[model samples]
Target: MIKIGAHMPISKGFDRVPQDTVNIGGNSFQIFPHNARSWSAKLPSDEAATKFKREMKKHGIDWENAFCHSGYLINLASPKDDIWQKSVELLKKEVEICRKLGIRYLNIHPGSHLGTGEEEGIDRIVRGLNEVLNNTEGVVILLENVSQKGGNIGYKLEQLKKIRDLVDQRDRVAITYDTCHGFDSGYDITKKEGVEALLNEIESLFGLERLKMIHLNDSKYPLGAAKDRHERIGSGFIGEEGFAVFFSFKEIQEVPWILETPGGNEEHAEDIKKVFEIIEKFGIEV
Candidate 1:
């Protein structure tokens, strides 16, 4: 089955997530366990966690298809010790939360080097991941690719592979491919050939098996712009035709497609409908 969904909100409560995912026509979805912009997060109580897990089971939401997004404030590659330490601690907590909620994947950006240089930044990320993985169990950390803006890392597929290779618990590390970031990073996925070339590179660097999820988004900016703006599917630079080519690939069908597209549930529902239309129009079987 093709697992498709969007990043959902937990403003109501964590227990509301499974129904919300189904409401938005999604079998797989993503969410932040707490406020995404802040460093502080309150873990759900045991009762709340039990209810959420029970609800997920009732709704047929597979834990493997559900993802928890790490807070944006986390920066494991920070040169300063305080930020780095906090980042590591917070990640450990995120993993704990995921385990409690029965979510199997925790997606995070590899983090920016903050002008400290790529090598140093990657080394820091490796160290931070080791510490977190050593403390946590039963949760896979999916490193997401960035838009290559500022000092962000993981824009290059090789960089992601390097980080995974260096980590002590490499088996627990995987990848989340963001279409917007790939386009912005100059992957030129607007065409079939470009998409093929990009896939070839990913296969060479990390193997297709390591790619566990896809952050399915269209880019607001042009290819190679290095911008991170996400636009609605078929409405932006990577139009319906581009996504048609994307969904045509049977190789990526098993990977869960989670939309980080612009807007809330209403817009995400529309985007999910648009994805179905594209798949139907191209006769691509999920």
Candidate 2:
């Protein structure tokens, strides 16, 4: 069975996090070590790390599964020199935090270029990522594909390919597919063949090995809308049929298909439960 998971709040200490995990039917989770909008925090104490590690292992969760989110403020593609410099420092801090938490992957949206042009934005991203790679004694920065809204450079698979091609030591760098963003950006994965083709593109461009995480969200808008709204698992544009196509893929089945899907806590687990029931029907009905 594919271990389903979701992004959960870590406002309380990581020690008490299992209850939240259970509430979402999540065996794995995504979290922000600090306020995601701020670059600074009250640096994590040893008590936090010890508790976090113990709790995650107790529940069979770790980096190959859970993902820690990066701050929204760390924009590597900032056009201004001062902001760019600050972005680098903040990203480094994020790496340090993830290391302490024993986080396997740090999920980041490839920074928006902000009118400096696509090429310039991409170059900034490459430079920022390379710097992070050199500094990391150990850390993996997984660039998430965007929803293709506004001036986001990495909204296309080819844009991601540009990031991949710009680097030599690609081990520390990785990619995550955000499904709602994928739909909003115009990949109509409601079709079985379409999903297969998109998966093929992932394999072809960055290869399967680079696929480090998936932000599993269903679209709230129509296909090709270029918006980032998320809806519940079966209620949105992808619907249950799209999920059938999703879970049918054997390779992704073994991978973590987390819900960035709409709904939280009480109903969130139900969102996952409904999908599991469908997968069960497929198993027994056949």
Candidate 3:
């Protein structure tokens, strides 16, 4: 129930996105204000902003149900000085964009440590987040967990807690549990009780309130494989059963959930409808 929604378009106009939701029966959603892969995007004109907000109003989405994206160029955990500095700058800009869009959450990966140790990478990410928050207002940053893939730094839940503690901005900093990453990191959420345990661990380590958004990606790889390939809902390792475990949680029903599965754009309509079915197939009750 945590207000069901998926990531959709805003730059193309919310009318297109909201209508797509109507077919899927979406009450909440997320989107990017510009090209997510690039550092620069055309400014949001007053007309566009106004129209976007109006469309959202009609759809009954206010704030917390919306999620936004940051540029892929950012790597806050990069130990290199030049790249880290630029990542910080670009991250600040993304935060600003989210603020203007009235986005409730901005999801970002904790960058890879490269050759640096896990401890150092965590510190660098915290520093980058603090800097971004200081520079941009009205938006909170959620450090997303990644698969234990090679070179990735945020594969551990404890590291997320460490970053949260070090950042010390308790109210502003939070965590997001990406389904693909958690499964790949060996949380063993492919079963019902396993998912309950993992979700409990998320709440205990960082508090349930810090859980801001969900990247609803089903891992194509097997459990503990550490791969990052995201397959469609129910078609992957973290399949329908695992999702039922997640959907059972009532506390996070209002938080925005978005799909970053393979070819999200190629089969956006199809995939989102799949997610919608996953949640409602049981009639919201066991």
Candidate 4:
């Protein structure tokens, strides 16, 4: 199966999120352990965390498919000293939560440079990741590609590769490719030529194994618009034809897919089914 899911809501409870995921016909899902935009978070109690792990296992979901998205306020590449330190601490705590909740993956974005050079931003990211890697265990940190808006780095394959190389621990690092972000960053993954270019670049950069997950959202803007607007699957710039090419790739089938599309829970469920329809339309065997 092509393991389709969405970023399920988690404000209710950790265990509840998986039930919601399964309710949406999803076998995998993503969530923010707490408020994703705030610095303050109420850590899950040991009992709560342990119960969450138990419930997910009962649902037949493994740690590999369960993802924890770190807070958006976390800028691992922040130019400011205070924000950098705070970001590092916040990420380290999230990793600890992942370990407790039996989630193998923790996804994050490489922060913007804020007018500082990309090289400098990348270096900060590398340093921050090293700190996080050194402090955590049993959790893999995934650096998601950006849409190249503002001064955000890591939109390029080369930049992601460089950060991976600079980090001391190779096994602990990975990547998450977002379809809309790729389109905004100018990869244009809506055609055979674009898809081929993407696969070729990823294969050359870090091989297929480094890509641990995908944010399967369509783009509201045209290709190379450099904006991050996620539309429903098959309903935007990356329409049904575009998804046919994306889901057809053998590389895409090997990993879990999470929809971060804009919608309420029911609408998100519909979008999840929509992605399946597109993949099926292409006769793409998972």
Please tell me which predicted candidate would have the highest TM-score against the true structure. 1
Per-residue alpha-carbon lDDT of model 2 for 21-121, expressed as tens digits? 86677776777767756545655789988888888777776558878778778788878878778788788887888888888788888888888788989
Provide TM-scores for the models: 0.97, 0.94, 0.89, 0.96
Give per-residue CA lDDT, model 3, range 130-201, as digits (tens): 888876676888788988765688888888888888875657888887888888888876666776787788
Query: Which should have the higher TM-score, number 3 or number 4?
Result: 4
Q: Between candidates 1 and 2, which one is better according to TM-score? A: 1
Residues 104-207, model 4: lDDT tens digits: 89999888888888888899999999999998787999889988888888888788999998999978999899988988889877788888888889889888
Q: Candidate 1 clashing pairs?
A: none
- Where model 3 places Cα greater than 4 Å from the true spot, the runs are 10-16, 36-38, 252-254, 264-266, 275-286
**Candidate models: Cα lDDT each:** 0.89, 0.79, 0.74, 0.85
Among all candidates shown, the one with the greatest lDDT: 1
> Which portions of model 2 miss their true places by more than 4 Å?
282-286
- Model 3 has an lDDT value of 0.74
Q: TM-score for candidate 2, please give it.
A: 0.94
